[PDB]
Paper text:
In order to characterize the fungal PDC, we purified intact complexes from N. crassa mitochondria and reconstructed its native structure from single-particle cryo-EM data. This showed a dodecahedron-shaped core with icosahedral symmetry, composed of 60 E2 core-forming domains decorated with many flexibly tethered enzymes surrounding it. While this alone did not aid the interpretation of the interior density for any such sub-symmetry, 3D classification coupled with the application of tetrahedral symmetry yielded a correctly averaged reconstruction symmetry, evidenced by a protein-like density and consistent background in the complementary interior volume. The first class has four interior, threefold symmetric densities, each immediately interior to an E2 trimer. The only observable points of contact with the E2 core are in the twofold interface bridges connecting the density-associated E2 trimer to each of its three neighbors. E2 here provides a predominantly hydrophobic pocket, composed of the C-terminal residues that form the bridge and helix 2 (H2E2). The segment of the interior density that binds to the E2 bridge pocket comprises a small (approximately seven residues) alpha-helical segment, here referred to as the binding helix (BH). The backbone and direction of the BH could be traced from our reconstructions, but the resolution did not permit assignment of its primary sequence. The cryo-EM reconstruction of the N. crassa PDC core exhibits strict icosahedral symmetry, but with an additional protein PX that forms a tetrahedral assembly interior to the core under optimal conditions. Two distinct tetrahedral configurations could be identified and refined to  ~4 Å resolution.
The pyruvate dehydrogenase complex (PDC) catalyzes the further formation of acetyl-coenzyme A (acetyl-CoA) from pyruvate, enabling the tricarboxylic acid cycle that sustains oxidative phosphorylation. The PDC is a multienzyme complex consisting of three components: E1, E2, and E3. E2 then covalently links this acetyl group to CoA through its catalytic domain. Without exception, the PDC is organized by non-covalent recruitment of E1 and E3 to a large core built from E2 catalytic domains.
Residue numbers in the entry:
A (entry chain OA), B (entry chain M), C (entry chain KA), D (entry chain L): 230 to 458
Write the structure that this text describes.
Amino acid sequence: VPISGMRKTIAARLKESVTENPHFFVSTNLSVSKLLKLRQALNSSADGRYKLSVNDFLIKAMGIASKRVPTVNSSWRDGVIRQFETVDVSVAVATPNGLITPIVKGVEGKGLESISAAVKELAKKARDGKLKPEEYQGGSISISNMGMNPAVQSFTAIINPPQAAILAVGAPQKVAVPVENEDGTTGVSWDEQIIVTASFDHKVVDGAVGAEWIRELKKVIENPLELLL
Amino acid sequence: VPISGMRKTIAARLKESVTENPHFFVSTNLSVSKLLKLRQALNSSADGRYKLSVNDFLIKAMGIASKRVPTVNSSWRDGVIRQFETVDVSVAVATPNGLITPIVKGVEGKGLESISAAVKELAKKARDGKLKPEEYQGGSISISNMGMNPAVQSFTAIINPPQAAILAVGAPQKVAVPVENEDGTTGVSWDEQIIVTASFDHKVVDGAVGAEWIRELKKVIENPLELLL
Amino acid sequence: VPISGMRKTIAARLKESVTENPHFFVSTNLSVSKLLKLRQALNSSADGRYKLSVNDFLIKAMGIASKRVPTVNSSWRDGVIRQFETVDVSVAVATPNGLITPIVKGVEGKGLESISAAVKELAKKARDGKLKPEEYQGGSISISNMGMNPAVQSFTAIINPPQAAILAVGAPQKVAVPVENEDGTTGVSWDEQIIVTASFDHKVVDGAVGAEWIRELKKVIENPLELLL
Amino acid sequence: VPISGMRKTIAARLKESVTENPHFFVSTNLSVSKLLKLRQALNSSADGRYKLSVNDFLIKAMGIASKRVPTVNSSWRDGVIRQFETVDVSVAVATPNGLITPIVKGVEGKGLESISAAVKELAKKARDGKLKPEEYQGGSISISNMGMNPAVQSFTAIINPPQAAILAVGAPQKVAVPVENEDGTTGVSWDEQIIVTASFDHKVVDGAVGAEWIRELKKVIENPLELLL
């Protein structure tokens, strides 16, 4: 079968990414037992005006982490580092045509409802093939999601240039966790975990900086109430 | 110590692989408690006519998944995608001379006993150094195994070109899993888990396609009776 | 009523068969209590993608037995024995026009789902009268089924030339079987049996060979897990 | 594969048999629970001087039945019926070369030990290929045995000409049988049965005659003590 030609550009782009920018990976585990309760409560206290998912919370947390650590929200240009202020998030969508990356603008201080609405709009518009180039050309940070497929415990991705980082969220799973009952003995409790994998560019970011970013993300998620901050 | 010269070719090949094809990894966890029982029962209901292993089941499942999702069983050629129909599986063997990749032909609809016989034959012939080039030059998909070494929980490998994907199977381990007793309380059950890592080329395959392939593999393994299908 | 003319050809064919080839019969009893459980479980673990019967398992077992004993998969030609390698299976279908024998190709190493799909397609095409001559001219081995009729315990058939053997599968029935309880006393267990009748041509096959073939068939059925092998 | 030529003669012989002689079959069920006890006791009350089987008892019973009903021990010749007085028994042996029928002479009034010795000698001489034509050319009645194969419940055979009848003995099996305990209630007893199939030529013998022969056989077996008579 001959190549469609469109895949050629994507292959060249990815080749540029891997050959220009080295890649190192960080892998952590989050706890979402409180996040799911929060999502359920907000969904129930509603009149069909909105519907939430895990990706939106993750996007808000990404924005907060980027603002607390601006070095990640950066890039690599001609002998100069370009540093933004806001957070432009590229969300991946898997069409039968292939892959596409619409963008959400001004995440930090936008609202989860607006986020979900914009993501639904862009996803349906990509399934229809009705996008503009500016809506998927740009962005400082990216994300790919596979939570629907329960088999994937974890996976890596490739950094869509000229960006510096990219995230990946596996499926949820059941894990054993210790717990202290009212007496001195320990007990078993079942916590819902997710694995998260972040690939970074080493020219800009160091292992310590990436670890700090991941720590802030884990903290914000495990304490969802700090999303207000 | 000067270089043997043979290692030069493998180095150049791996360099071509990583520089021509970008790599992204997927990591999942399988449950094999039923698979091991099946292997035990089939080994018992025999008269020394055969002996099975986990790799053979894995190879059969790879064939089934490749047939259900043919995009993986592909390659990258001069401005064209070559898509096969059958599944040619490259199995790795670690000789004192290094690494070698014999091939099994027409896996789908071949039989586990024939598979085991062919694998044993090729492995002993590789230990003796009695192979032909056609036997290890080709193949659409590959695999490497390290189950004998119990310490390796997981590992990655490199795509032997011109193929598109490669698999890797860690060791088995003991993991906690919830279970519902006959009453309403949950309990602790010890299941035998294996980590599996799949490296894909991003020019041909996308994340959704890889996830679908892994899902089918997990389903087939967890329900071994579907191997008949 | 004058004769349709089509029956003339079938009469001459059967006359040639009985006058050229002597017939001897072998009658055995199988146990399918495990087979039916397997079929029920595979049907339950599905999404309507397929639906299985007993004839398909029987056909797979026929292929396995033919491969373990290739002398059965034979014929008689002009001063020469033609021996095949693959198993082409002629399945009988009872149309209002009469009897017809479509063929399934390459049974050994094909898969039960594909077998069922091909059989359904051929059966509907025969009910419609839309077949080619090649699809029902050939085959090394044949079979006739009457399982829908619960009255028939056993029955013989006639060897469709130039083949050497043919099968016949009666209905299931309830039979008494001894069983040892946990104590030393025996008990009564109700097993679901089927009678099977195989007609052979004596020029090619002998009683010992037919008995060996039937033993392998009984073994593979009573241990359905060996269908993988 | 071209034909060995030896099979040509056997094919022509069997063709002559089926085209000259019509075949009808009679199928019955025996009870051997006492016979096996008798065999075990006679084997235990010995010094390794002999070793018995079931076929020898069967051959003695065949001789007794043939003498009680001489019409079976007959043939068909040129406008004349040739009737013998003694019973010459053709026993089948399955060599890798094919099938062969050595003969035992003067069965009636010979003794089971002598019968077993002669059968062992003839069987080993047939496995070695050291026979004379007279030793397997003749005989008034024939038999084939498949008791070693537990899968075969019943089977037919073909009349070796110019004889008029032939026997066939399946495997033993477990069957449910009623039994009256000391009280008025019935109970379940497990008896060891064998199916027996006798093929007859219809020119000489009729259904009533065959039934009488089978009745006498069943009687002598079920009451083994009448073997003395």
